[PDB]
Amino acid sequence: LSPQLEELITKVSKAHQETFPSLCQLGKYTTNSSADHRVQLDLGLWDKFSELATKCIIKIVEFAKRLPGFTGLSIADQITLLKAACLDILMLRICTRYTPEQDTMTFSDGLTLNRTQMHNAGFGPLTDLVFAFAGQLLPLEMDDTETGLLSAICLICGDRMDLEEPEKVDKLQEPLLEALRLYARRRRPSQPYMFPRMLMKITDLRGISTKGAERAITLKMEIPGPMPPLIREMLE
Numbered sequence: 001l002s003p004q005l006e007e008l009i010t011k012v013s014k015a016h017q018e019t020f021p022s023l024c025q026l027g028k029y030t031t032n033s034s035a036d037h038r039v040q041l042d043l044g045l046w047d048k049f050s051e052l053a054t055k056c057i058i059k060i061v062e063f064a065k066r067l068p069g070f071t072g073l074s075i076a077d078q079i080t081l082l083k084a085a086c087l088d089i090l091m092l093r094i095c096t097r098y099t100p101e102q103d104t105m106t107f108s109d110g111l112t113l114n115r116t117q118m119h120n121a122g123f124g125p126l127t128d129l130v131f132a133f134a135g136q137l138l139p140l141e142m143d144d145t146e147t148g149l150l151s152a153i154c155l156i157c158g159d160r161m162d163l164e165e166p167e168k169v170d171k172l173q174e175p176l177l178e179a180l181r182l183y184a185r186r187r188r189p190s191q192p193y194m195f196p197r198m199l200m201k202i203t204d205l206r207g208i209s210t211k212g213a214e215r216a217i218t219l220k221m222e223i224p225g226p227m228p229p230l231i232r233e234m235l236e
């Protein structure tokens with residue numbers, strides 16, 4: 001046991017909760033826009049969705065800055081890491097807000113969209129793949145501490161191209177991995193495959209983020225103007 005590792009778990013856990021409300025802590029509300037038929041793009045939904053996505057990018061940067069040692073990396077590396085992992089974390093976050101009973105996803109202001117509305121808000125051809133990933137995440141029954149640590153592991157990764165000090169990044173990732181294994185095994189000792197199953201979700205997330213970036217390219221041709229600036233930063 002390590003006092004420092006236990007403090008890291010709570011630090012990351014609190015950083016995640018304070019930048020990402022849990023599904024049960026949100027007062028859900030709906031909209032009746034394009035609710036019953038799939039269309040190429042409902043502009044009203046795209047406008048609201050893109051605004052919510054921008055707000056969450058700011059929350060992810062906020063979360064990153066609260067991760068022990070992140071602000072110790074060069075600003076260039078901080079930006080490189082965020083640009084490389086923001087969409088992965090955006091995908092994990094929306095998928096943790098999936099309510100299977102209603103086949104809905106919920107945003108941080110409580111906006112709860114059904115599958116067709118997610119499709120019409122911009123997900124388009126990627127809609128069902130995103131919902132399937134969310135469905136496959138359910139069995140893991142991760143809690144918020146686990147989601148926060150997994151997110152931190154996705155972000156603090158030394159394999160990202162253009163890092164100035166990849167070894168320093170690798171060193172910062174080490175305790176996050178130790179923390180997640182310790183926490184996960186302690187919480188559910190009879191399910192020892194949970195830690196490796198969680199780590200493999202990172203590869204799935206990268207796949208779904210890759211497809212999300214491809215969808216952003218086509219979506220650009222469907223919207224009247226350019227995507228929100230912080231979203232463009234993430235996509236470059």
Ligand SMILES: CCCCCCCCCCCCO[C@H]1O[C@H](CO)[C@@H](O[C@H]2O[C@H](CO)[C@@H](O)[C@H](O)[C@H]2O)[C@H](O)[C@H]1O
Pocket residue numbers: 055057058059061062079082083084086230233234
């Ligand atoms: C991957 C793409 C990201 C690449 C990095 C580029 C993004 C850099 C983002 C830094 C964000 C700017 O941060 C600065 O302005 C924000 C918006 O006015 C403020 O954000 C503030 O308001 C938001 C309301 O919209 C709240 O959700 C934030 O929790 C709150 O802190 C910050 O408190 C301030 O520090």
Ligand SMILES: CC1(C)CCC(C)(C)c2cc([C@@H](O)C(=O)Nc3ccc(C(=O)O)cc3F)ccc21
Pocket residue numbers: 049050052053054056087089090091092093094106107108109121122123126211212213215216219231
């Ligand atoms: C790049 C862009 C703008 C266009 C292409 C698609 C539609 C694939 C997409 C999909 C996502 C998705 O990860 C998501 O909805 N994250 C998400 C998670 C939580 C909140 C919140 O808590 O409010 C808001 C969100 F936005 C994010 C951005 C995009």
